[PDB]
Design a protein around this motif. Structure first.
Motif, PDB file in Angstrom:
ATOM      1  N   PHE A 182       0.837  -1.181   0.000  1.00 22.27           N
ATOM      2  CA  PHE A 182       0.000   0.000   0.000  1.00 22.27           C
ATOM      3  C   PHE A 182       0.879   1.240   0.000  1.00 22.27           C
ATOM      4  CE2 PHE A 182      -4.497  -0.880   0.579  1.00 22.27           C
ATOM      5  CZ  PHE A 182      -4.552  -2.186   1.029  1.00 22.27           C
ATOM      6  N   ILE A 183       0.609   2.182  -0.903  1.00 22.63           N
ATOM      7  CA  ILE A 183       1.276   3.467  -0.886  1.00 22.63           C
ATOM      8  C   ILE A 183       0.520   4.290   0.147  1.00 22.63           C
ATOM      9  CG2 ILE A 183       2.110   5.430  -2.227  1.00 22.63           C
ATOM     10  CD1 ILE A 183       1.403   3.632  -4.776  1.00 22.63           C
ATOM     11  N   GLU A 184       1.210   4.677   1.227  1.00 22.31           N
ATOM     12  CA  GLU A 184       0.612   5.409   2.331  1.00 22.31           C
ATOM     13  C   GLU A 184       1.041   6.868   2.212  1.00 22.31           C
ATOM     14  OE1 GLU A 184       2.056   4.681   6.584  1.00 22.31           O
ATOM     15  OE2 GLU A 184       0.020   3.813   6.669  1.00 22.31           O
ATOM     16  N   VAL A 185       0.096   7.807   2.333  1.00 19.14           N
ATOM     17  CA  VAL A 185       0.379   9.225   2.164  1.00 19.14           C
ATOM     18  C   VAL A 185      -0.005   9.943   3.453  1.00 19.14           C
ATOM     19  CG1 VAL A 185      -0.062  11.286   0.760  1.00 19.14           C
ATOM     20  CG2 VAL A 185      -0.031   9.029  -0.317  1.00 19.14           C
ATOM     21  N   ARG A 186       0.994  10.503   4.149  1.00 21.44           N
ATOM     22  CA  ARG A 186       0.784  11.183   5.416  1.00 21.44           C
ATOM     23  C   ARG A 186       1.030  12.678   5.240  1.00 21.44           C
ATOM     24  NH1 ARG A 186       1.022   8.315  10.141  1.00 21.44           N
ATOM     25  NH2 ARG A 186       1.157   6.048   9.942  1.00 21.44           N
ATOM     26  N   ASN A 187       0.264  13.477   5.989  1.00 28.85           N
ATOM     27  CA  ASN A 187       0.512  14.895   6.185  1.00 28.85           C
ATOM     28  C   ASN A 187       0.018  15.730   5.002  1.00 28.85           C
ATOM     29  OD1 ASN A 187       1.454  16.864   8.156  1.00 28.85           O
ATOM     30  ND2 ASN A 187       3.023  17.371   6.634  1.00 28.85           N
ATOM     31  N   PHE A 188      -0.883  15.190   4.172  1.00 30.01           N
ATOM     32  CA  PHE A 188      -1.294  15.886   2.966  1.00 30.01           C
ATOM     33  C   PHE A 188      -2.107  17.114   3.371  1.00 30.01           C
ATOM     34  CE2 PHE A 188      -4.185  17.090  -0.387  1.00 30.01           C
ATOM     35  CZ  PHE A 188      -3.280  17.362  -1.391  1.00 30.01           C
ATOM     36  N   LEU A 189      -1.553  18.310   3.141  1.00 31.66           N
ATOM     37  CA  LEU A 189      -2.086  19.575   3.628  1.00 31.66           C
ATOM     38  C   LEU A 189      -2.270  19.564   5.151  1.00 31.66           C
ATOM     39  CD1 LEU A 189      -4.288  20.890   0.681  1.00 31.66           C
ATOM     40  CD2 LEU A 189      -2.767  22.246   2.055  1.00 31.66           C
ATOM     41  N   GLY A 190      -1.347  18.892   5.850  1.00 31.45           N
ATOM     42  CA  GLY A 190      -1.366  18.801   7.299  1.00 31.45           C
ATOM     43  C   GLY A 190      -2.499  17.948   7.863  1.00 31.45           C
ATOM     44  N   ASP A 191      -3.077  17.059   7.050  1.00 27.56           N
ATOM     45  CA  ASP A 191      -4.209  16.247   7.465  1.00 27.56           C
ATOM     46  C   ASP A 191      -3.718  15.137   8.394  1.00 27.56           C
ATOM     47  OD1 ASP A 191      -5.542  17.861   5.479  1.00 27.56           O
ATOM     48  OD2 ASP A 191      -6.777  16.171   4.809  1.00 27.56           O
ATOM     49  N   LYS A 192      -4.516  14.840   9.428  1.00 27.43           N
ATOM     50  CA  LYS A 192      -4.247  13.729  10.322  1.00 27.43           C
ATOM     51  C   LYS A 192      -4.711  12.403   9.721  1.00 27.43           C
ATOM     52  CE  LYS A 192      -2.373  16.339  13.443  1.00 27.43           C
ATOM     53  NZ  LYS A 192      -0.928  16.279  13.681  1.00 27.43           N
ATOM     54  N   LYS A 193      -5.602  12.431   8.712  1.00 26.05           N
ATOM     55  CA  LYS A 193      -6.000  11.247   7.956  1.00 26.05           C
ATOM     56  C   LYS A 193      -4.787  10.600   7.287  1.00 26.05           C
ATOM     57  CE  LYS A 193      -9.550   9.500   5.732  1.00 26.05           C
ATOM     58  NZ  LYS A 193      -9.659   9.321   4.278  1.00 26.05           N
ATOM     59  N   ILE A 194      -4.713   9.262   7.322  1.00 24.30           N
ATOM     60  CA  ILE A 194      -3.699   8.516   6.592  1.00 24.30           C
ATOM     61  C   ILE A 194      -4.363   7.952   5.342  1.00 24.30           C
ATOM     62  CG2 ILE A 194      -2.325   6.387   6.550  1.00 24.30           C
ATOM     63  CD1 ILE A 194      -2.717   8.308   9.813  1.00 24.30           C
ATOM     64  N   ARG A 195      -3.841   8.344   4.178  1.00 25.52           N
ATOM     65  CA  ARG A 195      -4.355   7.914   2.892  1.00 25.52           C
ATOM     66  C   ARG A 195      -3.638   6.635   2.470  1.00 25.52           C
ATOM     67  NH1 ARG A 195      -6.846  13.598   1.369  1.00 25.52           N
ATOM     68  NH2 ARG A 195      -5.903  14.096   3.388  1.00 25.52           N
ATOM     69  N   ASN A 196      -4.392   5.648   1.973  1.00 25.97           N
ATOM     70  CA  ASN A 196      -3.831   4.376   1.542  1.00 25.97           C
ATOM     71  C   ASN A 196      -4.285   4.085   0.115  1.00 25.97           C
ATOM     72  OD1 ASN A 196      -2.202   3.282   3.843  1.00 25.97           O
ATOM     73  ND2 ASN A 196      -4.128   3.719   4.899  1.00 25.97           N
ATOM     74  N   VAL A 197      -3.328   3.663  -0.722  1.00 26.04           N
ATOM     75  CA  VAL A 197      -3.541   3.386  -2.131  1.00 26.04           C
ATOM     76  C   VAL A 197      -2.979   1.996  -2.383  1.00 26.04           C
ATOM     77  CG1 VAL A 197      -2.945   4.120  -4.496  1.00 26.04           C
ATOM     78  CG2 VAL A 197      -3.322   5.843  -2.728  1.00 26.04           C
ATOM     79  N   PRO A 198      -3.793   0.972  -2.723  1.00 26.38           N
ATOM     80  CA  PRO A 198      -3.247  -0.340  -3.068  1.00 26.38           C
ATOM     81  C   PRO A 198      -2.260  -0.255  -4.232  1.00 26.38           C
ATOM     82  CG  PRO A 198      -5.663  -0.390  -3.183  1.00 26.38           C
ATOM     83  CD  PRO A 198      -5.255   1.005  -2.767  1.00 26.38           C
ATOM     84  N   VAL A 199      -1.219  -1.089  -4.172  1.00 24.76           N
ATOM     85  CA  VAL A 199      -0.346  -1.324  -5.302  1.00 24.76           C
ATOM     86  C   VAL A 199      -0.896  -2.512  -6.073  1.00 24.76           C
ATOM     87  CG1 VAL A 199       1.974  -2.066  -5.981  1.00 24.76           C
ATOM     88  CG2 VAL A 199       1.655  -0.344  -4.159  1.00 24.76           C
ATOM     89  N   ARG A 200      -1.451  -2.244  -7.263  1.00 32.77           N
ATOM     90  CA  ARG A 200      -1.902  -3.263  -8.196  1.00 32.77           C
ATOM     91  C   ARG A 200      -0.800  -4.277  -8.462  1.00 32.77           C
ATOM     92  NH1 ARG A 200      -6.131  -2.020 -11.541  1.00 32.77           N
ATOM     93  NH2 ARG A 200      -7.520  -0.532 -10.480  1.00 32.77           N
ATOM     94  N   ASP A 201      -1.211  -5.529  -8.705  1.00 31.40           N
ATOM     95  CA  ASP A 201      -0.270  -6.611  -8.934  1.00 31.40           C
ATOM     96  C   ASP A 201       0.470  -6.343 -10.244  1.00 31.40           C
ATOM     97  OD1 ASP A 201      -0.645  -8.511  -6.604  1.00 31.40           O
ATOM     98  OD2 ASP A 201      -2.694  -8.626  -7.421  1.00 31.40           O
TER      99      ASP A 201
END
Ligand SMILES: [K+]
Ligand SMILES: [K+]
Ligand SMILES: [Mg+2]
Ligand SMILES: [Mg+2]
Ligand SMILES: [Mg+2]
Length: 189
Positions: free
Chosen positions: A111-130
């Motif tokens: 999973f590509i995890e994206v932290r701190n996007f515009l200072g957001d406390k939400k953690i964004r997760n993006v699956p890596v396709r096979d």
RNA sequence: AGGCAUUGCCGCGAAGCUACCAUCCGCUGGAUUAUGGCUGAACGCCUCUAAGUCAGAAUCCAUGCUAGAACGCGGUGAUUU
């Protein structure tokens, strides 16, 4: 007007081997194997020789014949992908808050995890396709590189990542933060 | 010690009933719309769209919850001298 015959050529290069039967295309090259079901289009594939496949429509309208050059491209891209491969580069863009990207595992998934996007406390997760391979370039600051045989898998996985970082309730002409595709290209050049 | 006063009247009053006047409890998956995208022709370029495809709403369908067709169905027990 129905055209009696339209025809495209697919140039097969040395290393690669195209099998086609009931419109299920298997391409096999150095970099690996791709398949593609084309049973959603009435076309006829034909082998001229080992280096050339023709694909034809008979007695086709404007819309049908438009599909034919699509079919050529989809099969050509399969061949490019299993010789030259595909590599999309994406840069991070941010005024203030450094976007913080890294690969994780959630039950051996990736999973590509994206932290701190515009200072957001939400953690964004993006699956890596096979079949897609992520790597963070060292020479360039804030650059992720997706790569793979399948352009449809690579390109969609980058779009998945671009889109997770959309800015809400703000003027996006000002708030230009995001992860954008900077370069579409091949692995070997 | 009791009757009558159309339950004579007053204080407390258990049980029962009951109150946002009391307390507890109120589920999580899939498919989509608008929209933004991917690949990509038509139209050697371009294009989210034409073929194909991704994400996605208080939506929809399930899950869950109520009834159970008195002419829908199953399993099973015992069947009288
Ligand atoms: K009395
Ligand atoms: K395009
Ligand atoms: Mg505002
Ligand atoms: Mg369509
Ligand atoms: Mg019944």
């Amino acid at each position: 007007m129905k055209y009696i015959q339209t025809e495209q050529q697919i140039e097969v290069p040395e290393g690669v081997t195209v099998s086609i039967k009931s419109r299920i295309v298997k391409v096999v090259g150095p970099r690996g194997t791709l398949t593609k079901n084309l049973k959603h289009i009435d076309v006829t594939f034909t082998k001229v020789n080992n280096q050339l496949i023709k694909v034809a429509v008979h007695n086709g309208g404007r819309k049908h014949v438009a599909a034919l050059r699509t079919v050529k491209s989809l099969v050509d891209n399969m061949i490019t992908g299993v010789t030259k491969g595909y590599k999309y580069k994406m840069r991070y863009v941010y005024a203030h808050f450094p976007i913080n990207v890294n690969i994780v595992e959630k039950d051996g998934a990736k999973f590509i995890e994206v932290r701190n996007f515009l200072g957001d406390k939400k953690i964004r997760n993006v699956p890596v396709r096979d079949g897609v391979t992520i790597e963070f370039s060292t020479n360039v600051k804030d650059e992720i590189v997706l790569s793979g045989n399948s352009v449809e898998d690579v390109s969609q996985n980058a779009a998945d990542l671009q889109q997770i970082c959309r800015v809400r309730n703000k003027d996006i002409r000002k708030f230009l933060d995001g992860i954008y595709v900077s370069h579409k290209g091949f692995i070997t050049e």
